[PDB]
Structure formats: C-alpha cells, structure tokens
C-alpha cells in the first residue's frame, strides 16, 4: 500500500500464486539459451525469478518485416492445469533423465 | 524427392503374358519358334495399405491454416471431372499446416 511516499507492506494471508510443471513440452521452450535469472552461485544470496515470454515467426510486409505472419502462435498460459497455493500448502514434482553419453 | 526410404521396400510384381505358339510346321526344325498367337489381358487388381498416424495435441490458442477447397465460384469444379470426362487435379497438396514448437 502506497500513501504518499511511504510504503506499507503487510501480510496478506489469504493470496495465491499458482504453478505448474510443463511436461510435454508444449509451451515455446527458452531454456539453454543462456540467459540470465538462474540462481546465484553463492547460497546466501536472494534471487527476483525473470519474466517469461516468447517471440514466433514473423514476416515481410511494407518496409516492415515485423507483422504477424498467420502461423504466428498465441499461447495462453492459463489454458494449462496449474495448482494455486496459499501460504500453507507447497509443490513437488520428480523427474528423470534419458541415458546420455557421459561427459 | 521424399518419402520413406526402406532397406527392404515393398516387392516388385512382374506379370507376363504366357507365350502360345502358332501352328508348327509338319517337318521337324531346331530353330527357335518365331510366330505366335496375338494376345493380351486385363483384371483387376487391389491393393490395401495400413498406414499409422501420430495423433495432434497442441495448446496454442489462436486457430490454424489449414487446407480449405478453393472458395471461388468455377466452371469447373475442384478435383473433378470435366464435360468431356476428363479427371483434373487443382492443387499439389503439401502436408505442412499444422505449426509445432521448435
Ligand atoms: N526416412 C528414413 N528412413 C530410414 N532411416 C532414416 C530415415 N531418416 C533418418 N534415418 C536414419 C538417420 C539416423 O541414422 C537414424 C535415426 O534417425 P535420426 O535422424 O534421429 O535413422
């Protein structure tokens, strides 16, 4: 809550978030891109999570190659299952990978 | 071109019209019979494929291309006969519509 210059943050007790794991790989995958938002090095450190987002195809048109072509994909995130946690409840999930050469 | 390549692909069929000779000559000869008996055939014939398809899951929100028959009035119909009875194809049709994620 902001008054004037003075913030007051309080404890809202009844908010969700709400998360879910993509397993089949359905949304644009931006991850091994390399980019920054992982967790810090050092285990003390406190870390803010990056936004998410995507860019399709785009095409020409104009002097401007940045319009929509029409097999340009919308995906609304709310459209997966997710489960929405209050304070007291948590999440877990458990994966495995496919055999791979060694390093 | 496309396709399938197969180490062992469909076998080949070979059909052949058995010979049958004219009549022979009374006095015995050793060369090779050279007139035969003009003849052809016909039948028909069928064939069945089973073909598997992998089956489309996909959560984008907005529609799709897809292939949609001309939308225009014709003379002609699409992929159909003429007057004269002659069957014409329109449109090579790609299979590629459908978007996936890279
Ligand atoms: N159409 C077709 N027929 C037969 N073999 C094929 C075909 N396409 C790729 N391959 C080969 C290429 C790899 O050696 C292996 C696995 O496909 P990799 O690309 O994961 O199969």
Redo the contacts between chains.
């Keep these: 809550t902001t008054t004037d210059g003075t913030k007051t943050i309080a404890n809202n007790l009844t908010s969700t978030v709400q998360v879910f794991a993509d397993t089949?790989?359905?949304?644009?995958?931006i991850l091994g891109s390399a980019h920054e938002g992982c967790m810090p090095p050092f285990p003390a450190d406190v870390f803010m999570l990056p936004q998410y987002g995507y860019l399709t195809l785009n095409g020409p048109g104009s002097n401007n190659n940045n319009l929509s072509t029409?097999?340009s994909?919308?995906?609304?995130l709310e459209?997966?299952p997710s489960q929405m946690l209050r304070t007291g409840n948590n999440f877990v999930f458990t994966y495995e990978f496919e055999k791979v050469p060694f390093h | 071109m496309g396709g399938f390549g197969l180490k062992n692909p469909p076998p080949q069929i070979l059909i052949k019209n058995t010979p049958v000779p004219a009549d022979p000559p009374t006095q015995f000869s050793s060369q090779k019979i050279n007139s035969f008996i003009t003849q052809y055939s016909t039948g028909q014939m069928t064939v069945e494929i089973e073909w598997e398809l992998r089956k489309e899951?996909?959560?984008?929100?907005?529609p799709?291309?897809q292939y949609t028959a001309n939308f225009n009035n014709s003379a002609n119909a699409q992929f159909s006969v003429n007057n004269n009875g002659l069957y014409i194809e329109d449109r090579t049709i790609g299979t590629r519509y459908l978007?996936h994620?890279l």
């Design positions: 089949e790989h359905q949304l644009p995958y029409p097999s994909a919308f995906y609304c459209y997966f | 899951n996909s959560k984008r929100w907005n799709e291309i978007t994620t």
